[PDB]
Amino acid sequence: LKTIKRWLEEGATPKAAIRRYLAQEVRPEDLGTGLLEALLRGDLAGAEALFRRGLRFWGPEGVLEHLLLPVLREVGEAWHRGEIGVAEEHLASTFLRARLQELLDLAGFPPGPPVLVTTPPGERHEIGAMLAAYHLRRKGVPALYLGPDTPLPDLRALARRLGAGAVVLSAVLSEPLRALPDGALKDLAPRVFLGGQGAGPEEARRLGAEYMEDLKGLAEALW
Amino acid sequence: SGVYTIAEVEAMTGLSAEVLRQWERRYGFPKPRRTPGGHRLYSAEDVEALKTIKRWLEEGATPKAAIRRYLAQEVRPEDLGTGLLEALLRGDLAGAEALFRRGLRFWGPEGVLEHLLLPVLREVGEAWHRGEIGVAEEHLASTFLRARLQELLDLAGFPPGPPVLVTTPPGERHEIGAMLAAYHLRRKGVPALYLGPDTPLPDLRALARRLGAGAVVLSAVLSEPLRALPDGALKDLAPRVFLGGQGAGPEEARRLGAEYMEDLKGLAEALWL
Amino acid sequence: EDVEALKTIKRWLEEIRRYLAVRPEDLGTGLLEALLRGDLAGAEALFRRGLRFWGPEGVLEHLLLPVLREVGEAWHRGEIGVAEEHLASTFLRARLQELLDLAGFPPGPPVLVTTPPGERHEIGAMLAAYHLRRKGVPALYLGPDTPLPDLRALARRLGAGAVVLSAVLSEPLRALPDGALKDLAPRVFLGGQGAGPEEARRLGAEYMEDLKGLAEALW
Amino acid sequence: VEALKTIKRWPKAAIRRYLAQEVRPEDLGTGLLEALLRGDLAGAEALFRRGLRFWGPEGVLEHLLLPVLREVGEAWHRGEIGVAEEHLASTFLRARLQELLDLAGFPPGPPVLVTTPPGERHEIGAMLAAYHLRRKGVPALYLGPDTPLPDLRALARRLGAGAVVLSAVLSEPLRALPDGALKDLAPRVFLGGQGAGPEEARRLGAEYMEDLKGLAEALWL
Numbered sequence A: 001l002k003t004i005k006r007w008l009e010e011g012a013t014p015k016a017a018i019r020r021y022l023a024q025e026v027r028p029e030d031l032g033t034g035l036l037e038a039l040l041r042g043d044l045a046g047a048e049a050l051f052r053r054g055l056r057f058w059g060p061e062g063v064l065e066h067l068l069l070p071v072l073r074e075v076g077e078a079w080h081r082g083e084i085g086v087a088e089e090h091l092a093s094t095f096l097r098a099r100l101q102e103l104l105d106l107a108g109f110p111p112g113p114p115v116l117v118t119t120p121p122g123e124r125h126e127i128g129a130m131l132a133a134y135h136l137r138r139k140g141v142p143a144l145y146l147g148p149d150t151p152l153p154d155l156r157a158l159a160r161r162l163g164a165g166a167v168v169l170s171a172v173l174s175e176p177l178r179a180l181p182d183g184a185l186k187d188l189a190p191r192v193f194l195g196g197q198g199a200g201p202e203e204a205r206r207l208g209a210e211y212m213e214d215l216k217g218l219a220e221a222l223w
Numbered sequence B: 001s002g003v004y005t006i007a008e009v010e011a012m013t014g015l016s017a018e019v020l021r022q023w024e025r026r027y028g029f030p031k032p033r034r035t036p037g038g039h040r041l042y043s044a045e046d047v048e049a050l051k052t053i054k055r056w057l058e059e060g061a062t063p064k065a066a067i068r069r070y071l072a073q074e075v076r077p078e079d080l081g082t083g084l085l086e087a088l089l090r091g092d093l094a095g096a097e098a099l100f101r102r103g104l105r106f107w108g109p110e111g112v113l114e115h116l117l118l119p120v121l122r123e124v125g126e127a128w129h130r131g132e133i134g135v136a137e138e139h140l141a142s143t144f145l146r147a148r149l150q151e152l153l154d155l156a157g158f159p160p161g162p163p164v165l166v167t168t169p170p171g172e173r174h175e176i177g178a179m180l181a182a183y184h185l186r187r188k189g190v191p192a193l194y195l196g197p198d199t200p201l202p203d204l205r206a207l208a209r210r211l212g213a214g215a216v217v218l219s220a221v222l223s224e225p226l227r228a229l230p231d232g233a234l235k236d237l238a239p240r241v242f243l244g245g246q247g248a249g250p251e252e253a254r255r256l257g258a259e260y261m262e263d264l265k266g267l268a269e270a271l272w273l
Numbered sequence C: 001e002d003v004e005a006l007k008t009i010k011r012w013l014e015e016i017r018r019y020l021a022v023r024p025e026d027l028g029t030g031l032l033e034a035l036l037r038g039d040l041a042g043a044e045a046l047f048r049r050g051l052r053f054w055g056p057e058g059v060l061e062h063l064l065l066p067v068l069r070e071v072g073e074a075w076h077r078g079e080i081g082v083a084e085e086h087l088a089s090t091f092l093r094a095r096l097q098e099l100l101d102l103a104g105f106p107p108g109p110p111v112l113v114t115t116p117p118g119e120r121h122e123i124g125a126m127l128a129a130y131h132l133r134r135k136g137v138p139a140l141y142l143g144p145d146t147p148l149p150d151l152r153a154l155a156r157r158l159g160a161g162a163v164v165l166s167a168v169l170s171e172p173l174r175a176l177p178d179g180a181l182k183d184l185a186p187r188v189f190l191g192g193q194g195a196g197p198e199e200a201r202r203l204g205a206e207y208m209e210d211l212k213g214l215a216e217a218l219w
Numbered sequence D: 001v002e003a004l005k006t007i008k009r010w011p012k013a014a015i016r017r018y019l020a021q022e023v024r025p026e027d028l029g030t031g032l033l034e035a036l037l038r039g040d041l042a043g044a045e046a047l048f049r050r051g052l053r054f055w056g057p058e059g060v061l062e063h064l065l066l067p068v069l070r071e072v073g074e075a076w077h078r079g080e081i082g083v084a085e086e087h088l089a090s091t092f093l094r095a096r097l098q099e100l101l102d103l104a105g106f107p108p109g110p111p112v113l114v115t116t117p118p119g120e121r122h123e124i125g126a127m128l129a130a131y132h133l134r135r136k137g138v139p140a141l142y143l144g145p146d147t148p149l150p151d152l153r154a155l156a157r158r159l160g161a162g163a164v165v166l167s168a169v170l171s172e173p174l175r176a177l178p179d180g181a182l183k184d185l186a187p188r189v190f191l192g193g194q195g196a197g198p199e200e201a202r203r204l205g206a207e208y209m210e211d212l213k214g215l216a217e218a219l220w221l
């Protein structure tokens, strides 16, 4: 309303002033909060609209790192502090996953020997794996995202049968990795990659997988 | 079923006899039958085909390409289910999507669910249980089909007004039945807010209060998570509480204090009125 | 169709929010009608709606292409002016550029995509680039109207494995000397409404009928 | 110290992340161009995003997009780079501007048709104008370049467009137009760009606008 008065003082007409203020889009720095606030009140439309802005503004990889991830992290912290309930997190996570799934389907899927992407048994956090899949696809790697929580014998069978060149695992929790016997990941695929918040160099060496710090290097390692 | 002479076809289609003769020789179409009278006769489906082909030519297609297109054999609707299953099982996302696209085009949104998405999901479960396929295979199929359902979900409207929370009982990780419920409700103009699976009842009641949710819908694929709940556990989740799914039943729903719904079609009528 | 709307609401009543919350067969028309009245908002929504139903490639074949042809025909018939077509083309081109940017761009020796000199229809080239991108080929779309000496230089310097040309008009191809496309790149691909096998053989490029075969061709 | 204070504000992984966060703004221009010229779309995209995050939407245009374009022009003119190279850079940079354009709002109400005079194929300045208008709440309809004046005049009539804006990068297409050719395109007709000038605009019966900042104000009031 202060801005509107400012525009009126500049010689603008009230009709023009009101229309301009309403037609005003949300500042990029505010996209994170806006997207979070939109989800918490069940405004899926506004949320989808806001994510789309960030996509155009930051780009595909950019909006994940600058919007999708920060919102999820804040959702996690708010829950741990007890500031939001589980249903709220569910709402945001399910949504943000749908967006990531769209981006994934829009990326190319090259032919040739696939790279199986998933999370270790007991890991139900799947978005980190989708990030891995998406970055690989964006770089021309036929990343086949299976979904999360795949038994090692079943994972090994698929990689053999499809002749997969590699397997990539995302560990958000460290407990499922620690619950695995030594060398559990060794013969999953010709190359085995382990990364994620719950992963580290020492634990990967124990399980017989190659540790990857960031997603950028994951692509270079494969190509 | 020959009914027209090449002279007659030239008059109807506007294509010269030389051209029609040439395309037959060069591309194998059209093929008029030869009568005992010796005349070579084109069918009514040859004329309409050539009218269509000619339109494609005017749009810039080459005769070879147009004819190849008209003739091109697509996958039969009855084989779409099998084809989609086989496509997923070899890690052919491209083929799998093309097949789902075709089925969606052929059956429509609700149609493709009953004729393709649901049958394939059911079959994947049976295949795993018989040891025919592994968990990784099933994971792949479910993730794919969930993405398709999410598209349809997003393609349906999201009406304003007090939402209807859709989720699964605590301990239930099968979410497609819930997405499916949300989808049917959106198609009928009801703002179904799908939360994802496995939601604690207190948190569920809290959100329903805060958003002023008019109703809550639960999908129970397994019966064990329902059995783990005390009598009347679902009573005060929302002003109205709905329970459905293979793991749900009228008796069990009555015990938990929820309204039981057999089919998704009837779920809409309960909410819409 | 505001009157027909009130009729539909009454039918449900005999048994408003439902009515406010589009059939796929009508997406083509709706998208065109929106553009023709300058409703970019409505247009963008309908394309995205079309996108989610047909998929990336599908919405191009079932929505982008039919609309453009109708725009082209309407222009010829005198139904619409050049200004209308301009609006529609710019919009649809923007959508394809989005899809193009949204698909991956793999590393390794690029494939240069453009049109022959004098060819200013660029969307077909974007279509070719896009299909290659979707199948994991590093398609570098340059834009239209690239002089052959310049195109050849870029391909040499970047070590491009191939060059792809889209010809919508056949005249700019005819204006080229025999074998003009021979030494552009290790492989040279020619396709489009204005291209044909004979003209391609003459210019020394490999003729490609459909975009599907173009991806297969590079492997 | 101010750098070190910022670095502290931003354990093993953190040091690599915090330190590699800084990048000289002045070097963004060259880096973006070099990225394009070797066909590195990934790097080019990354560099543009970095600059877009640093300077903002309006900022990245003046400090990155426009300077690069001009340099591409200079590089070609000196024989340094080929036409194919320039083509590549422009298409990329157009995509970015097109993104920024659609990112800005499209307000309701009578549109403003934006294009170039017939024979003008440089279109970025025209997009730029559409961008600047939209950001100030004016419903700028960008048509694309090279629009016949009668057709332009017809569309403006049908949509009840309040104004027409023309971007002239070359002066020849303006010189090729008859007196008063731009007079009745729309209730208001605006001509600007490196190929435009006050006297020439005056001849064609259009209002001359020096810069894009003032173009919005003319319409906003």
Ligand code: B12
Pocket: A069, A072, A073, A075, A076, A077, A080, A089, A090, A093, A122, A123, A124, A125, A126, A127, A128, A129, A131, A132, A168, A169, A170, A171, A172, A173, A174, A193, A194, A195, A196, A197, A212, A213, A214, A215, A218
């Ligand atoms: C959504 C969510 C859930 C959802 C999952 C939804 C789904 N289907 O994915 C549900 C509700 C199922 C859930 C459950 C639980 N979760 Co939870 N959840 C989250 C939340 C909010 C976001 C999850 C997410 O995907 N975020 C995005 C993640 C993946 O990003 P990121 O790890 O930073 O990833 C980066 C890098 O690691 C890289 N990366 C990822 N994968 C890979 C792979 C490779 C190869 C490479 C190179 C890099 C790489 O990509 C990113 C680049 O920046 C997080 C909060 C948080 N801090 O992340 C909590 C969080 C992870 N969850 C947590 C907890 C406690 C749980 C539960 C135990 C809760 C409970 N008591 O039931 C269960 C565990 C179930 C299980 N076994 O998985 C804690 C973990 C605490 C800990 N000790 O580590 C968190 C941190 C919340 C908190 N603040 O306390 N959760």
Ligand code: B12
Pocket: B118, B121, B122, B123, B124, B125, B126, B129, B138, B139, B142, B171, B172, B173, B174, B175, B176, B177, B178, B180, B181, B217, B218, B219, B220, B221, B222, B223, B242, B243, B244, B245, B246, B261, B262, B263, B264, B267
């Ligand atoms: C995919 C899948 C999974 C995925 C889930 C993916 C996901 N995120 O949703 C994963 C891998 C996680 C999984 C795990 C498990 N699953 Co499972 N899974 C399936 C599968 C193949 C389909 C799941 C699905 O959503 N299908 C769609 C279903 C719901 O369709 P439908 O039955 O025809 O349902 C209709 C109606 O019920 C209606 N409906 C559903 N919800 C609602 C709600 C309302 C209100 C209304 C009105 C109607 C309605 O919708 C349909 C309309 O026609 C099913 C097989 C099957 N037939 O369902 C097995 C199945 C359900 N799972 C099974 C099992 C055994 C398990 C596991 C215990 C396996 C294990 N040992 O680890 C775990 C349990 C996890 C848990 N805690 O919940 C068994 C169930 C055994 C039983 N009869 O008790 C099945 C039947 C497989 C089998 N044949 O053995 N599973």
Ligand code: B12
Pocket: B059, B060, C065, C068, C069, C071, C072, C073, C076, C085, C089, C118, C119, C120, C121, C122, C123, C124, C125, C127, C128, C164, C165, C166, C167, C168, C169, C170, C189, C190, C191, C192, C193, C208, C209, C210, C211, C214
């Ligand atoms: C938009 C448009 C323009 C815009 C272009 C904007 C832009 N930046 O692209 C502008 C305004 C520049 C324009 C100008 C002209 N155009 Co015009 N234009 C059109 C329009 C409406 C659509 C063009 C389009 O994008 N089509 C979509 C493309 C993708 O279709 P397609 O080429 O058939 O592509 C398919 C296949 O060929 C394949 N393909 C394409 N490239 C490749 C490459 C490979 C390797 C492979 C395998 C396959 C492949 O991809 C598609 C798959 O379905 C068409 C109408 C129409 N019917 O196409 C007229 C049309 C093409 N134009 C036409 C004309 C006459 C002109 C002008 C001469 C008008 C004039 N007098 O100035 C000028 C010529 C400019 C020049 N010198 O090149 C005529 C051409 C007729 C002819 N051949 O003589 C058409 C058909 C209009 C009409 N008469 O109805 N045009």
Ligand code: B12
Pocket: D066, D069, D070, D072, D073, D074, D077, D086, D087, D090, D119, D120, D121, D122, D123, D124, D125, D126, D128, D129, D165, D166, D167, D168, D169, D170, D171, D190, D191, D192, D193, D194, D209, D210, D211, D212, D215
């Ligand atoms: C990219 C490009 C092209 C591309 C255009 C792609 C496209 N789709 O738009 C193509 C390949 C088509 C091209 C062709 C040609 N071009 Co050229 N091109 C350029 C380049 C590198 C950038 C053009 C651009 O978009 N600039 C960005 C604009 C925004 O910058 P600006 O003009 O300074 O604009 C500012 C102000 O004027 C204001 N402004 C602009 N519009 C408006 C409107 C209003 C109302 C207002 C208030 C303000 C305003 O906005 C900006 C604010 O800073 C320039 C280099 C340069 N120095 O500009 C050469 C340049 C413009 N081109 C040039 C030439 C020679 C040509 C060709 C003749 C080459 C040829 N032989 O074919 C043709 C002409 C085609 C035609 N009929 O128009 C010369 C012009 C020389 C001259 N004689 O004046 C330049 C200057 C290059 C050079 N240094 O030699 N070109």
Ligand SMILES: C[C@H]1O[C@@H](n2cnc3c(N)ncnc32)[C@H](O)[C@@H]1O
Pocket: A075, A076, A079, A085, A086, A087, A089, A090, B198, B199, B200
């Ligand atoms: C990591 C995420 O796990 C979710 N979370 C915590 N407890 C439960 C539960 N009982 N059921 C389901 N999800 C739960 C929270 O929403 C948190 O954000």
Ligand SMILES: C[C@H]1O[C@@H](n2cnc3c(N)ncnc32)[C@H](O)[C@@H]1O
Pocket: A149, A150, A151, B124, B125, B128, B129, B134, B135, B136, B138, B139
């Ligand atoms: C019902 C579905 O449960 C999946 N399933 C079976 N065992 C496991 C497991 N250990 N972890 C995750 N999913 C499993 C199978 O893929 C089956 O299809």
Ligand SMILES: C[C@H]1O[C@@H](n2cnc3c(N)ncnc32)[C@H](O)[C@@H]1O
Pocket: C071, C072, C075, C076, C081, C082, C083, C085, C086, D146, D147, D148
């Ligand atoms: C192929 C498209 O080219 C456009 N078109 C036709 N004539 C001209 C011209 N003189 N200048 C610019 N564009 C033109 C029309 O809008 C047609 O649909």
Ligand SMILES: C[C@H]1O[C@@H](n2cnc3c(N)ncnc32)[C@H](O)[C@@H]1O
Pocket: C145, C146, C147, D072, D073, D076, D077, D082, D083, D084, D086, D087
């Ligand atoms: C102003 C811009 O025009 C481009 N340019 C110069 N000559 C041609 C041509 N024959 N065809 C296409 N573009 C050309 C150059 O790439 C220059 O940068």
